[PDB]
Amino acid sequence: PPPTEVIQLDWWKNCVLYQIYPRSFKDSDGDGIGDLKGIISELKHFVDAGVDAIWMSPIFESPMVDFGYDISNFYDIHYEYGTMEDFEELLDKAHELGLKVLLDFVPNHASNESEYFIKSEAREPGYENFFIWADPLPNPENPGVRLPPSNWVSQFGGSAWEWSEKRQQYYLHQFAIQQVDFDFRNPAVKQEMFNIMKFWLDKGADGFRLDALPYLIEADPADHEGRYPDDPLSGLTQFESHQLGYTIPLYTKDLIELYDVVYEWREFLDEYNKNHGGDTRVVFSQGYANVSMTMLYYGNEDGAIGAHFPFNFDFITDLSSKSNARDFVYIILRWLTYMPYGGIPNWVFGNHDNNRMPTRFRHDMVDGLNIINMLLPGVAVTYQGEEIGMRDGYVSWEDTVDIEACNRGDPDTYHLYSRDPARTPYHWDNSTSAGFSTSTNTWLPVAEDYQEINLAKQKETARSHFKNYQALTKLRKQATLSHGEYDIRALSDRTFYLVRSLPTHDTYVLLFNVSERRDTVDLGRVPHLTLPATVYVSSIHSARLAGHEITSSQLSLEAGEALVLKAQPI
């Protein structure tokens, strides 16, 4: 029978979404800092790679305490990265190449250098209640020793409460001292968030990543006899009272009221899209939470609609080099089992907040992991460098600039916390500073392996991570990946299959030996696979090349080996 026709999906339902970390992508001006003119000079890379949409880590005005996540002006561009004119040029050139562009910001908090905070601290009319301000806890026993409002612990270590001498109250910071939590029960705060989003959509952004949403709302002291309630204690002996893990965040994380804010954002965005037309503008939410709390970002049982999707961190939080094939299958099944009917799945293997994909897994698993990302239903998310298999770079204590590591760590522990190894500059080629900069003095050190692992090398060599990346993003154009069913099971502790199938269309099969040992499997166990089948993609050290035919039902896979097979339609 002739192949069935399929209805085209809206762009966000099956895009390849690439995360740029602008500070480390491309330095155009020799200061060792990535910049917007740098990104503009390499927009063609996303077309070459088969990326549909780029998001940037923050580029708004920021003192850079948390490299952009401490925003002092939500309406202008950080000078080290360029100007508003450069951003507008980036949007125009990206759109001309057919790319979508999303911006990133963290609604939860503003820099203490923001006009909001300066004015709030001054109790300026309209701003007095813009942030969470509290009096000290009455000390009737030592009237003279000042007590914080509650025992709340910051994500970045120490008390979540910072005394203001000027205002003679504490302000809340779930993150850095310099990152002040907005009061999301203040209508003026909610209106300012719509104002920011409308400003950037009007400039032409295609949507937003909205960061750190579990932390929006904290217990209302009206419900606790006018005090901020203590979070319950963990009782874990490895944590002292200034260490993250000392408290259970009952009153400070994943409060149900946060979701009302997200549903209100979605209603705003839906109105905006109705009144402007063109490509749908979207919101993709970030939060690390349990399955229940994460799925609530999609919407709820009462018909609320939230983010276009919450990001799926399962490959970061629940899989690693310790995982066997059964773990891989059981964790892949979690998002697919719990995600609401009609929701769009997404898959995230890395970001600027976690160690790089091949460092969390193994170097010989890069191709298999990128195949899982591209062959699962829904949206593939790629973190800068995954398309060439970048590894964590070495960063000394002396070179560490991550506030999270400076705050929580010391020269012996800092590696437990630092995100800097996943932020080292991108490897374009084997030139000075891996082609990232004409300068040797980069804001973070260039990883030692850049002569071995760089894009130019992988475009010249017959087989490479990047060429496999290109073959996979191209495969996503096939109806079997955009509209096909899925079946996933383990064949052994070492190997699993993923089958995409769709009547009258080619079948595609992943086989992946995720173990450190060779494995032999019976392909007769794989549903919808008739032999002979053809190798479409293989891992760079596979004995099988693309175009190789699989004729035998007995297949030996090397440690880390992955194959994509193209088989006849069902």
Ligand X SMILES: OC[C@@]1(O)OC[C@@H](O)[C@@H](O)[C@@H]1O
The site for Mg ion (CB under 5 A) is made up of 27, 29, 31, 33, 35
Please report which residue ranges of 365-464 form alpha helices under DSSP H. 366-375, 403-408, 455-460
From candidates 286, 442, 501, 539, binder to ligand FRU by CB under 6 A? 286
| 175 touching ligand BGC, by CB under 6 A | yes
Quick one: 64 or 490, whose CB is closer to its own copies? 490
Return the residue nearest ligand X (CB atom): 260
Please give the Cα distance from 159 to 505 (Å, whole number). 58
Select from 22-30, 34-42, 256-264, 518-526 the region that touches ligand X (CB under 6 A).
256-264
| 404 touching ligand FRU, by CB under 6 A | yes
Quick one: 27 or 404, whose CB is closer to ligand FRU? 404
What does the block give as tokens for 117?
A: 């905070």
Q: Are strands 16-20 and 379-383 parallel, antiparallel or unpaired?
A: parallel
217 assigned binding-site residue: no
What does the block give as tokens for 192?
A: 């300012």
Please give the Cα distance from 466 to 389 (Å, whole number). 8
SS3 state of residue 302: coil
| 244 touching ligand FRU, by CB under 6 A | no
From candidates 47, 188, 236, 250, binder to its own copies by CB under 8 A? 236
- Residue 457 CB neighbour total at 10 angstroms: 17
346 binds, among ligand BGC, Mg ion, Ca ion, none (CB under 5 to 8 A by kind): none
From candidates 17, 261, 379, 388, binder to ligand X by CB under 6 A? 261
Q: Minimum CB separation from ligand BGC for residue 213, in Å? A: 9
Q: Minimum CB separation from Ca ion for residue 103, in Å? A: 20
User: Please, are residues 159 and 148 in contact by the beta-carbon 8 Å criterion?
Assistant: yes
Q: Minimum CB separation from ligand BGC for residue 530, in Å? A: 45
469 assigned binding-site residue: no
H or E element: which one contains 97?
none
Distances (CA, A) of 467 to 26, 188, 369, 462, 539: 21, 50, 14, 8, 10
From candidates 114, 370, 424, 492, binder to its own copies by CB under 8 A? 492
User: Residue by residue, what is the 3-state secondary structure of 152-217?
Assistant: CECCCCCECEEEECCCCEEEECCCCCCEEEECCCCHHHHHHHHHHHHHHHHHCCCEEEECCHHHCC
Phi, psi of 401 (to 5 degrees): -125, -5
The number of residues that bind ligand FRU (CB under 6 A) is 8
Q: Which amino acid is at 537?
A: V
Contact flags string 340-359 toward ligand BGC, x per CB under 6 A: ------------xx------
Site for its own copies in 309-328 (CB under 8 A): 326
Q: Minimum CB separation from ligand X for residue 220, in Å? A: 8
31 assigned binding-site residue: yes
Q: How far apart are the first and last CA of the chain?
A: 11
Site for ligand FRU in 179-238 (CB under 6 A): 211-212
Half-sphere exposure (Cβ direction) of 127: Cα atoms closer than 13 Å: 12
Q: Are strands 549-550 and 533-538 parallel, antiparallel or unpaired?
A: antiparallel
18 assigned binding-site residue: no
Binding site for ligand FRU (CB under 6 A): 155, 211-212, 286-288, 353, 404
Binding site for ligand X (CB under 6 A): 184-185, 257, 260-261
